[PDB]
């Protein structure tokens, strides 16, 4: 069915000047962009956004990085969007992405496991939570 | 348990200059205001916000009225907030509110069944939907 | 002439539950509220907002306090609004406000010189800068 | 000196899937994107945004088109940004752009004089007005 998912272009991809190319890729893949904005997570908001990983070992590093500079979020809409966007971005480790998914966003724009260019919702439940965390219904147009 | 609910102060109460009194009431009743903003529904957004009533006879009237001028929305947080806020606002018919709930917001500021001063979420499900429709997680502070 | 000015209800007045009373006061004084939102200054944004005082001795204290919790900003519109609103809020020192302007907002809700309940733009130039700092034309309705 | 200017990607370029390419162009030209969002002008807001042309013959057509679908605005920052961005987008008539500025955005993505892909601020005064109309200081990051 037609679905919505969230992506966030991370500070590393921002600094590399990759924003336009990343959005263009999703446009070429046939998604509609339903919301879009540049903003900056405070450490506290980044922590809330990533609440599921609060226990994980990488948490503090992720929260600091994701609040270290402005990011760009977009809502992507399309058939089977959540699964397809996951596949388009590729594995979390950018170097592994180059090895197993060489056309993926992370392979093209990611550096390593932490600076990996982009976030995408990983499930219908997380997509629902993540979209609302960043955009209200008023911002979806 | 501690809950969050949405209120919206409607154009009639706005024009009457009731906004400050209405917010004060909720403050005195012990609620935390977690988000607040003045905005204006387009007819389309008011329709989406009220999607559950799209089949009802009053729908078009409601949509037009709720997009006829600016409104103010707030997220209210407190113990049992969803049911308590409903009870504070009183029955939908302002005139009836004056008859059976004379201290209710609608009794005090409502005119009739349409110009009834204020909206509040009516269930945990609708609260969840309505808060996200108006406010992102970034606007809840 | 009809003017716009900015007010910000500060964390002290927020915690005191003064928000509704403060907005009511401005409503009773005959102002239109043209924009309204609850948000939180990062220390950096509070610094930029108060750039004129960057050299003053109180600057760091002010920046920290104004980013220590959520605040509410409003655009107030009315005849001679900038000077009238200044007068309604009263002298910066809440204690002195109680001595020389006993009906002023700061007399009623302010504590001292730092926790003084409320900010208002102090000139046409600062009003223009401050309103744009907090609200876009899209948020004025 | 370092300046800020506003661009808006119009509904025609949006529908053509040109958004990513357009932002990429500005990134390659060496600008920093300081603010970015997708939103929709109401006819009234489009009219206010374009107040200077309220007397012109094309006004109603422009207002309707610019409110006919979602658009994307960005704040671009860089040395001499206002003048350089004007030149990059090219003349207003897309067909003339193709004739006299074949590398310009309007030549590449514009259709004619009305569907001409993109808006940019045309002077320091209009840039100041336009940026504030769309983005607050809080949104510039």
User: Domain containing C106 — which CATH number?
Assistant: 3.30.70.141
Q: How wide is the angle at C-alpha C72 spanned by C-alphas B45 and C92, nearest 5°?
A: 155
Distances (CA, A) of C59 to A70, C53, C66, C71: 26, 6, 10, 18
B partners (3+ CB pairs within 8 A) are A, C, D
Residue C42 among known ligand-binding residues: no
Task: Tell me the structure's resolution in angstroms, rounded to a single decimal.
Answer: 2.3
Smallest CA-to-CA distance from A52 within A127, A136, A116, A112 is with A127
Choose the closest CB to A70 out of D20, D27, D141: D141
Tally the C-alpha atoms within 13 A of residue B10's C-alpha that lie toward its C-beta.
23
Look-up: residue for tokens 């990051």? D141
Residues of D in contact with A34 (CB under 8 A): 38
Q: For chain C, give me the number of helices (H) and strands (E)?
A: 8, 4
DSSP 3-state of B54 = coil
Q: How wide is the angle at C-alpha C130 spanned by C-alphas B33 and A48, nearest 5°?
A: 40
How were these coordinates obtained?
Answer: X-ray
Distance of CA A103 to the CA centre of its chain: 17
> D15, A13 in Cβ contact below 8 A?
no
Q: How wide is the angle at C-alpha B79 spanned by C-alphas B77 and B82, nearest 5°?
A: 65
Which ranges constitute the DSSP H helices of D53-138? 59-66, 81-89, 94-100, 105-109, 124-134
Q: Decide if C35 and B36 are in contact by the 8 Å CB cutoff.
A: no
Tally the C-alpha atoms within 13 A of residue D72's C-alpha that lie toward its C-beta.
28
Rg value, chain D, Cα? 14
DSSP 3-state of B122 = coil
> C116, D27 in Cβ contact below 8 A?
no
> Can you give the residue range of the structural domain that contains B51?
1-141
Distances (CA, A) of C107 to B81, C7, C8, C89, C110: 33, 16, 16, 8, 6
Q: Decide if C139 and D138 are in contact by the 8 Å CB cutoff.
A: no
User: Chain C interface residues facing chain D, Cβ-Cβ under 8 Å?
Assistant: 39, 45, 48-49, 132-139
**Bridge partners of residue A7, in order along the sequence:** A74, A120
Residues of A in contact with D22 (CB under 8 A): 20
How far apart CA A32 and CA A81 sit, in angstroms, is: 10
> A7, A85 in Cβ contact below 8 A?
yes
Residues of D in contact with B37 (CB under 8 A): none
Phi, psi angle pair for C81, to nearest 5°:
-60, -40
**Bridge partners of residue C79, in order along the sequence:** C2
Query: Does the annotation count B53 as an active-site position?
Result: no
Rg value, chain A, Cα? 14
- The pair of structure tokens assigned to A18 is 């990759």
Smallest CA-to-CA distance from C67 within C37, C41, C49 is with C41
Count the neighbouring beta carbons within 10 Å of the beta carbon of residue D99.
Answer: 11
> H or E stretch including B132?
helix B124-134
- The pair of structure tokens assigned to C100 is 């020389």
Look-up: residue for tokens 């506003």? D6
Query: Which class for B138: exposed (0-12), middle (13-18), buried (19 or more C-beta within 10 A)?
Result: buried
Choose the closest CB to A132 out of B39, B48, B137: B137
How far apart CA C52 and CA C15 sit, in angstroms, is: 27
Total domains, chain C: 1
How far apart CA C37 and CA C23 sit, in angstroms, is: 12
Q: Decide if B17 and C27 are in contact by the 8 Å CB cutoff.
A: yes
How far apart CA C39 and CA A1 sit, in angstroms, is: 37
Q: Decide if D36 and A36 are in contact by the 8 Å CB cutoff.
A: yes
> B41, B66 in Cβ contact below 8 A?
yes
How far apart CA D137 and CA D141 sit, in angstroms, is: 8
> H or E stretch including C3?
strand C2-9
Q: How wide is the angle at C-alpha C19 spanned by C-alphas C47 and C139, nearest 5°?
A: 60
């Amino acid at each position: 069915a037609v679905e919505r998912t969230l992506i966030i272009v991370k500070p590393d991809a921002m600094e590399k000047g990759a924003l336009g190319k990343i959005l263009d890729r999703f446009i070429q893949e046939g998604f509609q962009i339903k919301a879009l904005k540049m903003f900056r997570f405070t450490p506290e908001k980044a922590g809330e956004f990533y609440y599921v990983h609060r226990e994980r070992p990488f948490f503090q590093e992720l929260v600091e990085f994701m609040s270290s500079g402005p990011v760009v979020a977009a809502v992507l809409e399309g058939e089977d969007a959540i699964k397809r966007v996951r596949e388009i971005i590729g594995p979390t480790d950018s170097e592994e992405a180059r090895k197993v998914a060489p056309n993926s966003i992370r392979a093209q724009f990611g550096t390593d496991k932490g600076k990996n260019a982009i976030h995408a919702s990983d499930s219908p439940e997380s997509a629902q939570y993540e979209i609302c965390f960043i955009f209200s219904g008023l911002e979806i147009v």
